[PDB]
């Protein structure tokens, strides 16, 4: 009746299979990000601590578009975090990446599945959708 | 395949959606079927608007929001909400576009009608699916045990089941759903756990004496003794904590809470337990074939996780069934995900890969052909 | 913004307003929230009538002056004097017109109706305010700490708060505003002073003592203990001097005023200690989030500024909540004003800057959508 | 626990930034009441001392509104003093420039935020009141 220590090991294996998928995936969109964040010279070592802050998110999406998005107050602080990402997800909603968890905090806390959870969503809608300009 | 085509395989069980690949053995994608929606307001300026938390991320703010299963014991109850956990599952870990992918689905057996062809229809037409397959659960369970003989009780967190087979023949009259699984079993918790004092009158905490009775309560394999010896409390009491901090000590609650899946009276029902419905199958069943039910009855699902049930089962289908013959039980690992694992590996059979439901094979024949590949 | 529309950040709280422009780290105005009344005659020709000084001005001639607070535990008592103290802060201090600004005004919840629209309407009224936001106390000192989770406790002059929070989610209910801040403690220092023969019936005096109380009254970690070894005074005794040029001694007469913040039977009320009252809000809170309002005990306000506070909270909140887990408390400096500088940060958001309350806004809708957007 | 010292830091910087306002706002005063002043020949180095008897800013409201103000006893004394800007008060009183902490003292002690407290109330109701001729 070993269910319980085999899901101990199995889950370990679903997110290994997860890691091996989202971190190939983070260096796809690394390459990808650092072709398009290279036009305003920002390089992209870590999605989950450069593009956390939300205003270099917005600076993607400025890059991809094309366009210009607001850049609210920035800090040490939790609230100057969320305002900036919560512009960016102010286009991003505008480009339909909906709130399934793709969300204000999850990229100021650089939630490893969901920072890439957003931005991979923002791949699956720009090679598919007009987050591109 | 895998990475290709690649036929998404999507367990969406109640409780718990459980999402992988074609070919993967481990469904990368687990996360509870909920949305968390909030209750009490806020007023910040910048904060996460959220208005629709989904899936596991709902498990973070269990007390602002309030937790929903948007599928009810096979029965999908809110349909846009089951396309909040389709597209967070397609979007935020499976991370491609079922525009491409067949999706094997997965759903519960004696299904009314429109749960079928809605599940799949929301799949056709919001997402784009260029094939799929809805699929019943326990004969999944089976492909991961990987056998055609026996009869298979996949009790997950919504619904038990005892689908019987022989050599890949099912017997569909004597198939028998149940509502006797790990969302039942935590409302005769709540009910029996404040009898100590302990009330938990929100959702949240519901999934937190569901990990309570995940953890702690067992299946006493004689149940009565096992009150009996409730009387002195050496070991059967058990200290738990909160994520408040605070203590819990449970004693016989533990056993007689999943004994309500083998004394439904303890919810108050007519039905009887698990084993009685298994057993009740095999009277539906040929004299021939009987006795390869008896040594052959599998286990699958969620709330089969818990300690103590297979071997009460011996124990009681021996006292049911003819014990001049062998009543083994076959329970093996993974049994929750055995569901999923045998579809992630049916998928991966090229015989299987002529029997999707393809995309104009819905559109312009029909949503009821559904049925005609799904039964 | 920033000297252009520029949102006039003004904290009303009892005691002090401190007032700058939207971006400002430091509020250029601060001075306290009276106005000077003359009690004895003078003929003398030629001399300042003044008949109300105000604010700062009143600091000079405390003799004189009967020195009032137009606001009482953010409940406005007088609306003109109210009004003084605002004409004052726009003309002698923000030294601009309102007339073309928005002014973010704070206030204390759980107001009475009138509080948050006359506030509002003095402003739009007698003053012009194109737009302009009365606001919640203890958010905008969360909005300066920053932070989204945790609970906040405000203790201005006037009015100690409980206000929860949990990323960006409030619970209105598990808010609790208490009348334990500076005013109170001083009117406890009064008559706890007097028994070593010092009178002060005055005013005047009752912000020297005050001021006594800001320098000299810590909080007694533990209290009873300090109390047993005010028995031999060794350090505990100090030397104060008035403007008089008159010293007193103060002993225990120290520790034990601010105390009636954490045991108000010093005062003599129901209520309990600023411990107890977070505690209490945590009470109706939600098992899930209740650890995260444990190790995010923020601290605001002017009687706030005490030594000897937040040990002695992260030590009785041990005693209260479960110490199986932690219980941070998160004192940052500019407590006091953190309230404003967080509303001088808040109107710097774009975000925010939709959230006011514009001039046709308030004319033709109401003074009813005041509380439609500040609640 | 350290918001104590920090108001030490603070309010040096409350009243740095308002001197960095009042003193730029002294010079707009300054040479806007030399553009005034310089009618009656008068100029102005410092408002806090120039305008500091009551009856200079008698002048200074005489050359504004075009007018004739009383001119009563001045000399060393403080009476000197306060009637002097009292009777500017009369006028500005007279122009709604309330008692808001505008004083005869003030301006008699050459208060440094009162002093001009008050001349840019003149200022904030010469061009928007009818301090003007």
């Known amino acids: 009746n070993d269910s319980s220590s085999a899901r101990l090991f199995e889950r370990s294996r679903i997110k290994a299979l997860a890691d091996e998928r989202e971190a190939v995936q983070k260096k796809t969109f690394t390459k990808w990000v650092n072709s398009h964040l290279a036009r305003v010279t920002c390089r992209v070592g870590d999605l989950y601590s450069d593009l956390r802050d939300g205003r270099n998110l917005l600076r993607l999406l400025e890059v991809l578009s094309g366009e210009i998005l607001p850049k609210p107050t920035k ?39 969901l920072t890439l959870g957003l931005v991979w969503t923002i791949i699956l809608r720009f090679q598919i959708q007009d987050i591109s300009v | 395949m895998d990475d290709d085509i690649a036929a998404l395989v999507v367990d969406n069980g109640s409780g718990m959606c459980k999402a992988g690949f074609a070919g993967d053995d481990a ?41 929903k299963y948007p599928i009810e014991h096979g029965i999908v109850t809110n349909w846009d909400d089951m396309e909040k956990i389709w597209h967070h599952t397609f979007y935020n870990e499976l991370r491609v576009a079922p525009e491409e992918h067949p999706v094997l689905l997965t759903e519960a057996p004696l299904n009314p009608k429109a749960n079928r062809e809605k599940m799949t229809q929301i799949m056709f037409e919001t997402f784009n699916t260029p094939a799929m397959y809805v699929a019943i659960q326990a004969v999944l369970s089976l492909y991961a045990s990987g056998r055609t003989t026996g009869i298979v009780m ?53 999934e937190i004496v569901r990990d309570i009775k995940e953890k702690l309560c067992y299946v006493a394999l004689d149940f009565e003794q096992e009150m009996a010896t ?32 083998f004394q439904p009276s303890f919810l108050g029902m007519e039905s009887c337990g698990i084993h009685e419905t298994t057993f009740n199958s095999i009277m539906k069943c040929d004299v021939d074939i009987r006795k390869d039910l008896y040594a052959n009855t599998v286990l699958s699902g969620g709330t089969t996780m818990y300690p103590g049930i297979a071997d009460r089962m011996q124990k009681e289908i021996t006292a ?11 329970a093996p690992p993974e049994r929750k995900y055995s569901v999923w694992i045998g579809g992630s590996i049916l998928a991966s059979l090229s015989t299987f890969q002529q029997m999707w439901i393809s995309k104009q094979e819905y559109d312009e024949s029909g949503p009821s052909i559904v049925h005609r590949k799904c039964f």
């Open chain 1, 75 to 113: 800090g040490r602080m939790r609230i100057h975090c969320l305002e900036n990402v919560d512009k960016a997800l102010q286009f991003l909603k505008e480009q339909k990446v909906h709130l399934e968890n793709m969300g204000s905090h999850d990229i100021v806390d650089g939630n490893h599945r």
């Open chain 2, 230 to 261: 409730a009387a002195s409390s050496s070991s059967l009491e058990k200290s738990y904590e909160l994520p408040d901090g605070q203590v819990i000590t449970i004693g016989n609650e533990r056993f007689r809470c999943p004994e309500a899946l």
């Open chain 2, 27 to 67: 469904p990368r994608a687990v996360f509870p079927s909920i949305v968390g929606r909030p209750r009490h307001q806020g007023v910040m300026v910048g904060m996460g608007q959220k208005d629709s938390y989904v899936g596991d991320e709902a498990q973070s703010k269990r007390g602002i929001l309030t937790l």
């Open chain 2, 154 to 206: 996949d009790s997950g967190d919504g619904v038990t089941h005892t689908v019987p087979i022989y050599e890949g023949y099912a017997l569909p009259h004597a198939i028998l759903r149940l509502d006797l699984a790990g969302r039942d079993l935590t409302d005769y918790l709540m009910k029996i756990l404040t009898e100590r004092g302990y009330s938990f009158t929100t959702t949240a905490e519901r």
């Open chain 2, 320 to 330: 049911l069934a003819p014990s001049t013959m062998k009543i083994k039980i076959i």
